[PDB]
Design a protein around this ligand. Structure first.
Ligand SMILES: N=C(N)NCCCC(=O)c1ccc(F)cc1
Ligand SMILES: N=C(N)NCCCC(=O)c1ccc(F)cc1
Ligand SMILES: N=C(N)NCCCC(=O)c1ccc(F)cc1
Ligand SMILES: N=C(N)NCCCC(=O)c1ccc(F)cc1
Ligand SMILES: N=C(N)NCCCC(=O)c1ccc(F)cc1
Ligand SMILES: [Cl-]
Ligand SMILES: [Cl-]
Ligand SMILES: [Cl-]
Ligand SMILES: [Cl-]
Ligand SMILES: [Cl-]
Lengths: 392, 392, 392, 392, 392
């Protein structure tokens, strides 16, 4: 069992492992496209010679609070053959990729987790939260105060308006923490999933506004449910207008969307309760590779005074942290630590999705100063609510 | 159809309406106990003479941010006979009770809503959020960092340790926004629901720590599910210890609790995802009766500079609002309004459960200043997370 | 295995057989009340000595078309021990009771069937049809044309208004084909089933109009469903008013009732489809004991000319049948038969629930004259639609 | 928003709206075939320019009581974009098509309704009733009296016996109220739905008798259920023989068919209850365009004396109606009305599916004469029971 | 209705009957391959001329206790048209095939039964038992004593390792009672079912050991269930190693397999209960064609002394049976019978799947000697447990 970068001959063996490992495996055509986002030496394989282990990272651009875009290593296609479990192959592959990511100069790594129990021990913390809202649209009445009391929204074929979706998404991802650049190969892939599959998914439709879109399809088996796969809105007007159109799908009983906890949809209706939360789960996970680089890169709340502390990350360094005027300075120190946490915990705070005082309550984050806790809570909070871009 | 305070002879007619109106009706014995919390002239009935309409308020004590306790009118037992719908009887009864509540000097009214669509139009906004967490306890492993790595928790009969529950609850309700004083009649009622009912609920058990308790019972029909009816913990140690004991119910597959969005339980486990959010709903609703009295009574975040604005409440007054040093001064003015909202919206902000920028996004809250929005968000936020005490 | 009238000592043995035979067995207290409607020598038992077989008839009064009331033998409590199946005990018991019923001078016998396959061979035909309608009351809007565009309907406790229900029911049963006299013991029984049972059925409520009532209860397990056990209305106004009140049960999603195919409820709503037919089954079964007596006793449609034919009932006699002016004369003859049918078929036509041309289509009813078929269809039809009174 | 006849360039835009509006949309190939039944100027579209609104009628031939065939405008493909709801586009499109249908000389219009609440207000009433019967065929034994006590029925491939199905259907539709001419394009379409679809419906089989056929297929997901899509039988022998063959599908637990309330199948079995009614819904809806033309065109029951009355249709004319010898004469008058009804109510009576006395009971039909009610009931009744041909 | 061997022209008619008779019909391509295993005059058809009846046998090789391979007539493709039920066509076809099978010199016939009630009366008895085990693999821990405490198992594409599966299966079928030779056409068919079907089954994967394989696929609809279609293991090591790999499918909740009652999997786990038996059914059915030939051909338990008896088979002959040294001698006699049974009962004993004392308890097997019963039980038992090869 040696650990190597895969040659062109290794990829059929990797696709076999993928097929047997991932029930949602996108198949070798789509896999070969996503592959274009993997840099030279971005992938590792373990051979026995068939492929019994693999992992790779993609070059991503992640928006963080203060509309700052970070180079991000996006982990994906991680798999150990069922024949080689509990043999330390994951530990080995994760260690080599983290070495390579660190040496390449990425301040953060990110992934989507298949189980919530695997990734904490490698320094990844859940950084965004997925909310499923299901609206019973038969009772849905808009509030007097809701914007848009002619319709600016058009029902369209997704493939005929690619440029407009690209332009809107590009605006969206640049101003939203959790936003990812979507390169051209992923627009190629997204608009191929929009066509109907014989015995599979139904045709996708689009609702297009100047400042937003929604892609939706009727569910395979429940023909009274519309699944909104993606709603990107750059103004409140766009968001409301798109939801007026979705509530107008009179052949449907229910509209479902995977969104964020701060989605304003419930407040657009006369009955907040009609927008039921049917599902909640961790979205994007972050590993802070370089603590000082990441802490200095993001903006902080202007609505908190200048304050200084010493942060210790468990086997990750000790740092003098000074926050003021929505900037941070983060420098080496051996001064006594005022706040202790494992690396994963820092990942979870980084995008504002979790409160420091909540992680303190579970003792994932030790300090003896209540005042420092409130200051961290306020400073790390994001004015624009954190959202999840797309699964990778 | 006249509107009157009920005499002793009206209560059998009110109990009939209750039985036919509420599927969870507690019956006339329990109803007669809850009645002791209704002041003279706290109830109205509409006669035709049988009772075709009723509503009342109870004298409550509600903890708000800054550990301030407000006298609160608690609306309950509101019902219109199925024979007298769409006749304006609710509008009439709500108007008379609000007159009486206002004249009596209550700064706020509160209720639990049977539908999320009825109460917005009378100035009530949802002020607390209920989270159901279901733990699959077979996979539940505690984190290395979790407190309590002898057990201080005892399995006990609820009725044998009333004083200890009273003392712990009394500590809890005084330091938690959403907390209500539980008077002696409601402890009498709570510990009567703890006994098993032939063909009904199973026996309730208690887990008792010096600084917390949990009351739980096995579900009637699902015999692999324990329902935690109530967990009150005054320290993180108490909270963790009680959850160690609950995960130790080895005859159960699942533990379910109705808690708050900031419950730290997910962070105590090695897998955050095991604590699934299975249900989410509005808890307590607030009507701010006297805007200046309520705004001045609660504490605000110390972690935001002094700032001034003009708040207009739709048909509720215009006010110069100055917030600094976690206090507010709220005085009459005719100066141009910088922030507009309906009364219900103010109720929803009041306990910190909803962000101003989220209600702005739905246009329930109009301002032309982004900076004022961020300041409101930060100032109205609560360091202690808002919880729900008990249904009334 | 001898066949005898039971002595007082046989009834405990009969109650044992009942308990083991009928899952809905009403128990020995209620059974002892229903027993008061069984005449001397109205019951048979087969002993082996334990009771291995039993059957009895009750003295009933059945309304038939033209508001004519017939003495009717009501078969009930029919059971063969599981230890004595396929031994001809049913055939024996049915033969002895039919002999006794015939000799006593009953023109018709009736029963409610436990299986639809047992009773055809003894000359019983299904004579009334049960429709379950379920209304989703959240979408229910009344039509502009619906009567009742003060409410005359009261929500009441059933036991406090017995006289009013008796008076309304008595009016109803006298003018409706399928109507049965409800004696005092069955009002005693009906109003005892109105109280709540610990671990059983919930409390029954009543909606009372001068010319109608509805008894309803919430379902044990589905707490969003109200089951209307009984709705008796003597005017269209009463029927509509009661349904306005039932649609006003705002805590319910669904109202269900067991009614008749000609219930006008669907036509009272702006959407006929909201009143879904969820269940359909045979109600009352008739055995015509004396063909000429029964045919002469009921009224016929005035809206068909005088016509004559010869009816043969298979091993039941041949008769010259003359119908005109809504009366029939039915006399012995040996003239060639124009219409042939088994006895059960006659039972099925007798109350107007089934069309002759439909039974002809299945060849349960042979004739070589299409014109005679249309005449029978029209003459046997009932202007007041046939309903089912109560199960016995 | 202008209203126009569509050009060849509008149809791709109409197909987009169809796809997003109808979950059962037959697709553009099949749509282009059905299009051949739309006359010049039979379609309207609303442009904004994309298609935001459409409606059309097809040239149909509808059999009415007395085996009379009427030219019928068949409304279909009616849709308003989700972006243009509650804008009066339906009201506008329905008004223009009704103008065109009226001016073209159609006595009646018809449709199949997507919701039971949309079409009453435009003068359409439900005119036929759909019964689903499900037979548990494992218990199904035929009655001694059932016809067919060699088999004349053949199991065949539908596409190899098109001429025989055409000939049988043509005989069926000419003698059955509700019957529609099926033109050649719809036989092309029907026999293309008979082939198996990969991941879709299973292969269709045919049971062929000289005087009837049944097309059936096994359900996609329930492999113990056979769905009879269509059973056309011109004699009782044919009907029974086909059902003997269907009960002979020994690999099936259940046979289901959508039929009419007067289907004689229950009476062919020793247990009527085995043929459970599992579903009931409105079939064809009628709008009487020209009251006198329609009333004069159909035959009436010969089994009722000559009688005269004055019929008022709400904003539809007042008419002297004389019925005798199964013909009607319907002429203008200003004499006092004896019977009042909205137009939709007339549609519902027209094919005999609903009784006048039932609509009177709901006050959809006002008269002060009970005798006139019984006469209408009897005269409007159909000797051949009303059935539904095919959905359009 | 004549009975004939089918010509080449009859097969399209037979495929039609198959399609309408069998929901799992493999289609005409696969049917034409299986056809290569049918000898000249191995098939019968009944014509009316369409095919209304068919049956055939295939040339099989069945392993019986003592690793003896018997020529076996494998009945399959047996069908009577739904139009020709209860006409004695099955009785006729079964009689002609049994004549042909007997005259050809087959000692035994075998089939898989569609219903458990059809085949007893033609002398077939259930001879093997199917156990479904479902493992919840999340709790599955292997016992300290389990073999395999490098992995020898490989995850592979089935079609790339045909020779290895053939070699392993060939070893398996030769040493296991119930084993069938799998000819090349059935390997062609098996490895075509291994590819994914659009809207159908998912891709099949293989786990390959030197001395065993497992073919498995994820279920269509339950994406947390892996279905093991086939596990062939020639050593305990191979069996355990393959199950270590299957429990290693970490994306799955459950692994299901159809196996035999003596599968040792439950004993490999620390918790025997994790391997739940979810389904149990008769597998292969045997008809002993020639009693003496079959009884003499198989080996018997060496662990029972020499003993002699007289066996009578109902209308099948009387025989002197002597068993010793694991051989039997079976010769004609007219001596009084000590043991009586119908032919089907002999089929059920023949492979050791059922105990004589169990069939005696149900009186399917009469003797007056308890000692003879114990001797039969012990002698007929198989040291290698009886398994089922593949459905035909
Ligand atoms: N999780 C999802 N539904 N889609 C993400 C697809 C990621 C993926 O398969 C992949 C495949 C090959 C690569 F080189 C990189 C990534
Ligand atoms: N909602 C719950 N489960 N319990 C609250 C019970 C409130 C109640 O019924 C009541 C009854 C009588 C009164 F006077 C005041 C209140
Ligand atoms: N079928 C129902 N739900 N009730 C009918 C009760 C009839 C009955 O048990 C009975 C019992 C004793 C008698 F003597 C006569 C009748
Ligand atoms: N409702 C169904 N299942 N089939 C009816 C199809 C009707 C239809 O789509 C259509 C399409 C185009 C036209 F020009 C006319 C009609
Ligand atoms: N029962 C299964 N799933 N497969 C067995 C297929 C047997 C079969 O169809 C067949 C078809 C044609 C023949 F000539 C012989 C056999
Ligand atoms: Cl999102
Ligand atoms: Cl809470
Ligand atoms: Cl009824
Ligand atoms: Cl039909
Ligand atoms: Cl097996």
């Amino acid at each position: 069992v040696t650990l190597c970068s895969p040659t062109e001959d290794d990829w059929p063996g990797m696709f076999l492992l993928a097929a047997a490992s991932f029930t949602d495996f996108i198949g070798p055509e789509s896999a070969t496209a996503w592959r274009t986002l993997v840099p030279t030496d971005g992938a590792v394989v373990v051979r026995d010679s068939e492929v019994v282990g693999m992992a790779l990272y993609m070059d991503l651009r992640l928006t963080v609070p203060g509309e700052v875009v970070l180079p991000t290593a996006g982990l994906s296609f991680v798999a150990v053959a069922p024949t080689h479990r509990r043999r330390g192959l994951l530990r080995a592959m994760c260690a080599e990729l983290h070495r390579r990511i660190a040496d390449s100069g990425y301040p953060v790594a990110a992934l989507h987790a298949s189980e919530g129990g695997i990734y904490g021990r490698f320094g990844y913390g859940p950084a965004t939260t997925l909310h499923e809202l299901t609206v019973d649209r038969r009772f849905a009445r808009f509030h007097a105060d809701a914007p848009g009391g002619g319709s600016s929204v058009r029902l369209v074929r997704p493939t005929e308006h690619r440029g407009e979706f690209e332009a809107i998404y590009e605006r969206w991802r640049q101003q939203v923490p959790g936003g990812l650049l979507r390169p051209q190969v992923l627009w190629d892939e997204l608009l191929a999933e929009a066509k109907a599959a014989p015995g599979g998914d139904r045709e996708s439709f689009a609702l297009l506004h100047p400042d937003g879109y929604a892609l939706y399809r009727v569910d395979r088996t429940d023909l009274k449910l519309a699944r909104v796969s993606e709603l990107r809105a750059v103004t409140a007007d766009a968001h409301c207008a798109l939801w007026r159109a979705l509530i107008g799908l009179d052949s449907m009983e229910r509209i479902s969307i995977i969104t964020h906890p701060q989605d304003p949809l419930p407040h657009l209706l006369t009955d907040t309760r009609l927008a039921r939360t049917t599902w909640r789960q961790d979205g994007l996970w972050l590993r802070i590779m370089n603590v000082p680089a990441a802490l200095e890169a993001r903006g902080y709340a202007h609505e908190v005074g200048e304050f200084s502390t010493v942060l210790e990350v468990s086997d990750g360094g000790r740092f003098a942290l000074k926050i003021g005027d929505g900037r941070a300075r983060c420098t080496p120190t051996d001064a006594a630590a005022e706040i202790e946490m494992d690396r994963d915990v820092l990942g979870s705070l980084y995008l504002g999705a979790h409160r420091a005082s909540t992680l303190a309550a579970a003792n994932r984050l030790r300090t003896k100063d209540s005042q420092l806790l409130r200051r961290l809570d306020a400073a790390f909070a994001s004015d624009v609510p954190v959202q999840t871009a797309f699964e990778f």
